[PDB]
Symmetry: C3
Subunit: 225 residues, 3 copies
Amino acid sequence: MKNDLIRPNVLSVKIISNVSPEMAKKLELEPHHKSLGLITADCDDVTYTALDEATKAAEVDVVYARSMYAGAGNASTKLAGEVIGILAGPSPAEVRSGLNATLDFIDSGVGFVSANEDDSICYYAQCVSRTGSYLSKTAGIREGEALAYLVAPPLEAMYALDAALKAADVEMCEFFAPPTETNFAGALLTGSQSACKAACDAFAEAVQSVASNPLGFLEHHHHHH
Amino acid sequence: MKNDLIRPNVLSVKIISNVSPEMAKKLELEPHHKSLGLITADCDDVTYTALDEATKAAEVDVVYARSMYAGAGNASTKLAGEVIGILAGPSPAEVRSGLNATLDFIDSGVGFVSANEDDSICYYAQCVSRTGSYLSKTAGIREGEALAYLVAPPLEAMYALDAALKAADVEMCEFFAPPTETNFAGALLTGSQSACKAACDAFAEAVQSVASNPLGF
Amino acid sequence: MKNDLIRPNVLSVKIISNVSPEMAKKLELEPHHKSLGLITADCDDVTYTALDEATKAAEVDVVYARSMYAGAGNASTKLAGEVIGILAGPSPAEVRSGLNATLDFIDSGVGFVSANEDDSICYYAQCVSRTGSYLSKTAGIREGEALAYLVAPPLEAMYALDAALKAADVEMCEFFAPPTETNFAGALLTGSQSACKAACDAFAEAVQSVASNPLGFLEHH
Ligand code: NA
Ligand code: NA
């Protein structure tokens, strides 16, 4: 029901030690990247946030991060979910430390929030109060700066992004144009921690507004047609 | 059943007034684009045709129009459908007018047509007698020229495009290479209005032929 | 159940006898490509292998070959499946010959194999002993050289590719980065037929290992 947290789930985790050179080349790894940590889950943006948290916890870089077409509910196999993440580090021990931090974050209480009775509309409005190396590079900001990580379905996201930008002293960093692979959209915005929180609150309120009344236009403006 | 119209449905409509400069930049809006009209629906090509119609009905441009991966039946949320369209114009009045025209067209009787008993094969074969400013740009043709807008599933579309091109003096302007995001295919063809209609008729007949006999070669 | 073949199915096949010049342009056909053979099926990588086999059997080229977003189980229409392939040749007879070779290969016993009890994890580990003109070009190798054609879901594929590369005397040719349209991943690897076979066996073993222990990563490395 509305305001319920949708629990995210990790599906698979593995380590590759001493990554083969042939794979290192196709993944465009750095010379010091000797080991990989692999993860899949049923929620991509929670996982991306978790991977960023991993870069604060261990000597790891996010070297691969992609979402699956049409999202987890349309996965055709058990472990595909809707995201694959790859951490790289100098040793299996560092990768292992990174993956443990990732897993712990995914199960920390974060998640998309439901906007209606059957959870058929949901959104992410996460204040990342201290970015790691992954999301700061994605956003083009300095490490440790704050972000509003805003995700919703396509029309809700566009409407609510406008609301969020107007509500808060925040800057556009990265636009997720609709559709991304999972048919969502949104943005990374930056500013002070209080401004990012204000943007998150406004984004959430705007998504809920659309969910509650998606076709109000018909009665107000399409009458006598 | 065969020849039934599949009714297209609008799922959500919203307007943005005084669009934020940050969003204007990311959408690559023009300076006169102050207001946005947003729409989602469960049929993308009908919506694209309707958005083009709106540019003839109001002072609006189609500034964004994209389809969802794997189509409306695989939507994971209620309002995603399989298309998002954005109209831009100088005022809320003009984008409401544009949306009203879009809605009218979507409800006008246009739509995908079923080619079999359980409506599991369908196609779009729509003659656009006079393009607006959106489908003329997509096709790379002069504004106001006619189009045949032809869509079907991948193999049906390739087979039926062949038939359409042979049936009248038309040129292929834009090829929708399989898969588009919704796993369809097709093309925009141009020529005289009567040639485009002949192409539409041939396209429809060819899709029906494949539906009736999918493995016969 | 585990080790079961998942049988691939052909959904539609048609011939265009004299392709129109407008269609030839958009498909970037060459002048000698007069006839087209169209096929869809519910298994893309089996079909790609089959199309390559067709080029060995007949004077046909693979001129178009693409997978559908989210795979055959999410198809919204009857004939879309998860792949469209197009053969081009000099005549309808030659295209028909190519299509027959394609269909025969699809039904030959090749296919994805289940890695668990409800067939919810599967993989492809096919040794192409002698490539035709399609997969040799895709891989960037001489026509007639061998490939391991390795496909699995995203994490399994990455883990199992590393295993295959370490186990077998093979080289990386083409990386299918996750996700491809059907949300799979994998690679084409080349080497002797022996080495390609060893890569296939190691890939299969590694995918099965992940299926049996999907969350396990704490063991000594
Ligand atoms: Na589905
Ligand atoms: Na090796």
